[model samples]
Target chain A: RRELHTLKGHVEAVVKLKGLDIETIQQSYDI
Target chain B: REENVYMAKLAEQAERYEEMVEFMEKVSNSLEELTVEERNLLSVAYKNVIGARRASWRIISSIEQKEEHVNSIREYRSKIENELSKICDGILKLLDAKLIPSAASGDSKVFYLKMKGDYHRYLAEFKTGAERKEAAESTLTAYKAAQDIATTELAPTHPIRLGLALNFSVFYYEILNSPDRACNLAKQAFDEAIAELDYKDSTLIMQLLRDNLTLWTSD
Candidate 1:
C-alpha cells in the first residue's frame, strides 16, 4: 500500500465518508 | 368500541402502537361479555381497531430490535472513533518530528485542530461526570482554535468552517450547558451558510441548522 501523506486531509475524508455511510444507514432504517 | 377506536387512534398518532395493541386486545376480550345485539352493533368497530392493531404489530415486527440496532450504532461509532484516533496519532507524530507546526495558520493546521476536537468529543461521549467534562472542555478548546484559524484563512461558507461552527455550537449546547451561546453560534453559522446561495449543499446545511433548533427547542 502507498504510504499516506497529509494526515489531516485523509482524516477529514474518512470522517466525511463515515458520516455519509451513517446517514445511509439511518435512511435505510427510516430513522 | 367507540372508546377503543378513539384510544387506538390516539395511540397511533403518538406512535405508541404497543399500547394500542394491548388496548385493542382488552376491548376484544370485553366484547365477548356483551349481549348479541350489543356486540353486533360494535363488532364492526372492534374489528377495525383489531385491524389497526395488527397493522401496527406488522410495522413493529418489520423493524429491527431497538436495543440491537442501538448497539450496532454504538459499535459503528466506536469504529469511526478508532480511525480518528489513529489519524490523531499520526498528526501528533508529525508534529513531534517538527514536520508540522501546531500553531501554523493554514488548512493543515485547521484540519489538525478540527480532528483533535472531534476526537475529544468522541471521548466525551463514552465518558461520564468529571472525565466527560474534561474531554468536553478539551474539545471546546480545539474547536475554538480551529474556528479561529478557519475564519482567518477560509471563506465564510467553506464546509470546514461551517462544520467547525456546527460542532462548536453542539459542544456549547450539550457539554457546556449554554443554550444561549449555542443558539447564537448556530444562528450565525446558519445565516452565513444561507448567505452563500451558490453553495452546493446549502439545503443540507439549513436542514442541519433546523435540526439543531428543533433539538434545543423541544422539551
Candidate 2:
C-alpha cells in the first residue's frame, strides 16, 4: 500500500549543502 | 605668582584632558573597520545568506549612480532581477523540503506525517519560544566584551580582532533575534559596512542598511 518510490523521489530532490561553510561563514560574519 | 603658576598648570592639564576627550570622539566618529579581512569574509557570507539579493542590488545601484532615473535603467535591470528570482527559488526549495510530506498519503499516515514535518520546520526556525532571547543575551554580552577588548587593546586597524567585533554586531542584528538590539547593532555594523563600502562602489542595499542604522540612532 505504501508508494515507496514516490517518496524516494521527493527525498532525492532535497537540497543538501554539505560542508557549506556555514560555521566558517557565520563565524566570519556573526561571531 | 605661585597661584598664577598653579592656575597655568591646571589650565594645561585641563587642555590635555580636553585633547584626550576630543581624540576619543574623533576615533568614534571615524569608526574604521578594525578587522578588514574578516569583515570582507563576513560581508561575503552576509551577501550569500540574504541570497545574493543585496549584491545584485549593489550592481544596479552602482550603474544608477551615473545614469539618470529613466526607463533605460529598467531595461538592464532584468539581469539582476533574474538573480533575485533564483535566490527566491532556492529559499522556496528549502522551505518546501522542510514543509512537504515525503510519506505516503493515507487516512492513517497522513496526519502523523504532516504533524511531524510541521514540527520539524518549527524547530528549525526556532528551538523554543525563548531560545532567540537567550541567544540574543549571550551574543550581545560577547559583543560587549569584544568591544571592550578592541577599545582597550586592539589597534584601530587590526582587522582580525575588529572583524570579530563587527561580526558580533551582525550576529546580534540577525541571529540573536532581538529587534531592538538588532537595530542597535545595525548602527555599529553600518559604521563598519560604510567604511568598507568607501573603498568600493556604494551598493543598493545601503538604503535598507541606512534605515536600520537610523532606527538604532534614533532609539
Candidate 3:
C-alpha cells in the first residue's frame, strides 16, 4: 500500500540487522 | 528446566520455531526470573514466529491495494494480522507478567523492555483508531524505559543496547512520524558504536543503525 511506503527504511533496516548487506533487500517501496 | 532449556536451544538450531517457542515458554513460565540466555532464546523463537506473519501481512496488504477481489484478500489479511497480534500479545503477557518484574540485571531489563516495545510496535503497524493509539503510546513508554536503562547500564557496544536503539529509532520514525528524532537517535548510536568499533556482538545492530541513518538522511 502507498501508506506503507513510509516503512521503506525500516524494511531495509531489518535486512541489515539480519546481517544482510543492502544489496540483498528488495526495494519494493522505493520512491 | 535444564532439559527444557537444552531442548529450546536445540529447536532453535533445527529451526523448528513451534517447538522452540514451546520449550522456551516452558522454561520461561517456570522461572522466577530469566537469565539473559533464556530471555534471548525466548525472543529468538517468538521473533521468528511473529516476524514471518508480519512480513507476509505487509506484502498481502499491499497486494490487496491492486487486486480486484478486495474482500477476499482483506479476509485473508485479517487472519494474518490476527495471528500477528496474538503472538505479540502473548509475548507481552509473558514479559509483563513475570519477565519484566523479576528481571534483575540491566541486560535482562533492556532486552525485556525492548521486546515489550517491539510487540507494541508491531501492533501499532496494523491497528487503527484508539487501539493503534494505545499501541503507539505503549511502544514509546517501553522504549523510553529501555533507553534509560541502556544508556546508564550498558556499554555502547553492547548488542542488546545497540539493538534497543535500532528499534527505538524505528518506532520514532515509523510510528511517531518523527524522522528527526529517529535520525538523531540512529546517529548517536552509530557514532558511539563506531568509537567502540570493537564488538562483534554489536556490529550487526550497528549496521542497522548506520543503514537507517543513511536512508533517513538521504532525503
Candidate 4:
C-alpha cells in the first residue's frame, strides 16, 4: 500500500504537470 | 552540418539524448577541419545537443524512483558534468579571444548554471547530512548566478528567465523549505509571463506555476 501510494502520487503529479508529454516539453525547451 | 543539426534536433525531439550526444560529438570533433562558417554552425549544434541532453536527463531523473535508475542518473550526471566543463572552458576561451560576444558568453553561462543547478538538486535527493547540505547549497548558488545573468542579459519575458525562476522556486520550496519565497518568486514570474501574452506557451507556463503554487500552499 505504501509503495502503491507513492507510485500513484508520482504519476498524478506527472499527469497534472503534463510532464509525460516529452515531445511537447522538448519543443517548449527549444522555444 | 545542416543534416547533422537536423538529425540532432530529431534525436532531441525524440528524447534520445545518447544519440543526440553522439551526433554532437561527431560535429564537434570535425570542427577543426571545417571552414569558419561551418565551425560556427557546428558549435551551435553542439550547444543544442548539450542543452537537449541535460533537459532529457533532468526529466528522466525527476520521475524515476528505483535505486538502479537513480544510480544511472548519477553516472550520467557525472559524464554530463564532465562534458559541460569542457564546453564551458571552450566558451570562456572564445570570449577571451573575442571570438564570441559578451551576450553569447552570458547566455552560455546562464544555460550552464541552470543545468548545474538541476544536477545538484537531483544529487541532493541521494545524499545525506553534510553531503545533502552541500548539494543544496550548490543548487542555490547555481540558480542564483543563473538568475542574475539571465535577468541582466535576457529579455524580461525570455523563456530562460522563466525557467530559472521556476527551478529556483522549486529549490526554495522543496529543499530550503521556504514556501513564502518560492510562492513570491513564482508569482512574480507568472505575472511577468502574463504581461508578455505573446510569448510562446505563456498560458502553459502560467498553468504550471498555478499548479505549483497550489501544491506549495496546500502543504
Candidate with the greatest TM-score versus the true structure? 3
DockQ class, candidate 2 = incorrect
Candidate 2's C-alpha runs over 4 A off are A1-31, B1-126, B129-133, B176-186, B189-219
TM-score of each: 0.48, 0.27, 0.85, 0.56
For all predictions, the C-alpha RMSD in Å is 24.6, 26.2, 6.2, 9.1
TM-score comparison, 2 vs 4, better candidate: 4
Best by lDDT: 3
| DockQ by candidate, in order | 0.02, 0.08, 0.07, 0.07
Q: Please say which candidate is ahead in DockQ: 1 or 3.
A: 3
- For candidate 1, lDDT tens digit of each residue in B1-219? 767656755765775655664554445454423333332223233323332322232223223233346566555545544444443343334333432243454555665576567556645644566867878888888888888888788876776677677767777786667788988888887787767656544354455666677767773
Ten contiguous residues minimizing lDDT sum, candidate 4 chain A: A22-31
Every model: iRMSD: 15.4, 15.3, 8.8, 9.4
How well is each residue in B113-149 modelled by candidate 3, as lDDT tens digits? 9899989998998999999999999999999989999
How does candidate 2 score on lDDT? 0.36
Q: What is the lDDT of residue B175 in candidate 3?
A: 86
Per-residue lDDT tens digits for candidate 3, residues A1-31, read 2232224545555555766432433222211
Candidate scoring better on DockQ of 1 and 4 = 4
The candidate with the higher TM-score, 1 or 3, is: 3
Runs in model 3 deviating more than 4 A are: A1-31
Best of the two (2, 3) by lDDT: 3
**Model 1 docking grade:** incorrect
Per-residue alpha-carbon lDDT of model 4 for B90-118, expressed as tens digits?
Answer: 44344334332222455566755675676
Candidate 2 residue pairs that clash: B34-B159, B35-B159, B36-B159
